[PDB]
Amino acid sequence: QIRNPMKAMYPGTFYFQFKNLWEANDRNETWLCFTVEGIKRRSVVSWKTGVFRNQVDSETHCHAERCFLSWFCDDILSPNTKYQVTWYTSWSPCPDCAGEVAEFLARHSNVNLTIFTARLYYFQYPCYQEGLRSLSQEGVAVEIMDYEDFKYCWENFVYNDNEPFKPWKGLKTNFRLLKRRLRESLQ
Ligand SMILES: [Zn+2]
Numbered sequence: 389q390i391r392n393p394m395k396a397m398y399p400g401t402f403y404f405q406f407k408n409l410w411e412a413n414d415r416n417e418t419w420l421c422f423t424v425e426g427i428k429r430r431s432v433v434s435w436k437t438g439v440f441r442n443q444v445d446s447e448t449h450c451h452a453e454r455c456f457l458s459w460f461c462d463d464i465l466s467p468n469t470k471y472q473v474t475w476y477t478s479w480s481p482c483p484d485c486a487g488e489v490a491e492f493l494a495r496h497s498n499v500n501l502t503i504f505t506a507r508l509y510y511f512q513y514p515c516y517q518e519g520l521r522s523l524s525q526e527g528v529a530v531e532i533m534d535y536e537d538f539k540y541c542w543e544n545f546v547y548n549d550n551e552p553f554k555p556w557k558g559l560k561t562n563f564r565l566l567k568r569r570l571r572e573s574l575q
Contacts, residue, residue, distance in 0.1 A: 389462075391455040393438025397421075402546045405478045406538060408506045408562040415507070418442040419478040420452040421545040424460070427470040436464065439545055444479070452477070453485040457492050471499040476533065476541050480509035486519030490526045502529035504537050508566055517573050524574045532566045535559065 397405075397419070405419045419441050426434040440459075442452030453475075460473075481489065481503070493499065503523070510516045520530050533541075535555065542553035 389458060391440070391450075391459055392463075393422075393440055393456075393459060395438060396544075397439050397546050399546055399548060399551070402542070403556070406506045406533070406541070407556060408533065408566065409556060409558055410562070412507070415478065416444050417478070418444060418452045420456055421476040421541055422456060423472075423474045423544070424464060425472040426466065427472070434464070434466075437544060449484060451482065451485050453481055454488060457488065465496075469498060471496075473499060473501045475501070475503040476537065476545070477503060477505050479507055480505050480511065480516065481519060481523070482509065483515045483519030483522075486523050489528070490522060493526060493528070500527075502531065504531045504533045506533045506538075508532075508569060511569065511573070520570075521574055530570070530574070532563055532570055534563055 401419075405415065405417060407415070419439065421439050422437070424434060424436040426432065440452040440455045442450075442455065456475075489501070493501065523530055531537075538555070538559070539553040542548055
């Protein structure tokens with residue numbers, strides 16, 4: 389094992405990598421932002437934050453989602469405590485990652501997960517849709533990042549230097565196109 393989570397991201401990187409505008413081209417990296425929240429009946433700690441990143445193809449299946457899964461198991465896990473994991477990924481989980489998550493979930497009954505995504509990854513091919521569809525069936529929330537989501541990420545995973553979040557042109561219209569697409573696919 390090697391991977392430990394980064395604490396945050398640079399404003400240059402975040403604005404580049406989380407662009408939901410139809411630049412399906414050059415973005416050849418996957419970026420995962422998470423929050424992990426422990427609850428011992430009275431909603432105590434833990435609270436954890438971080439950033440995982442990943443090359444889309446080389447390497448593969450030490451994917452940003454697995455990196456998180458692997459790290460989360462050893463370094464964070466506590467018996468008999470309700471967890472609330474939240475992901476904000478730049479690309480949609482591949483079916484493999486999606487399948488590996490479902491397996492991780494059945495093993496850890498005391499953990500819940502929601503995923504927010506900026507773009508939908510390789511979504512014309514059935515395998516990738518099935519993966520998310522499977523997560524929908526396994527009980528996982530899969531959502532498209534709206535305004536308040538990109539802002540939340542700025543307020544949590546970026547070295548923002550006290551600057552406020554500032555949306556890109558057509559962020560809102562992208563969001564809806566991606567919402568309908570995801571809606572139709574998870575019906
Ligand atoms: Zn994957």
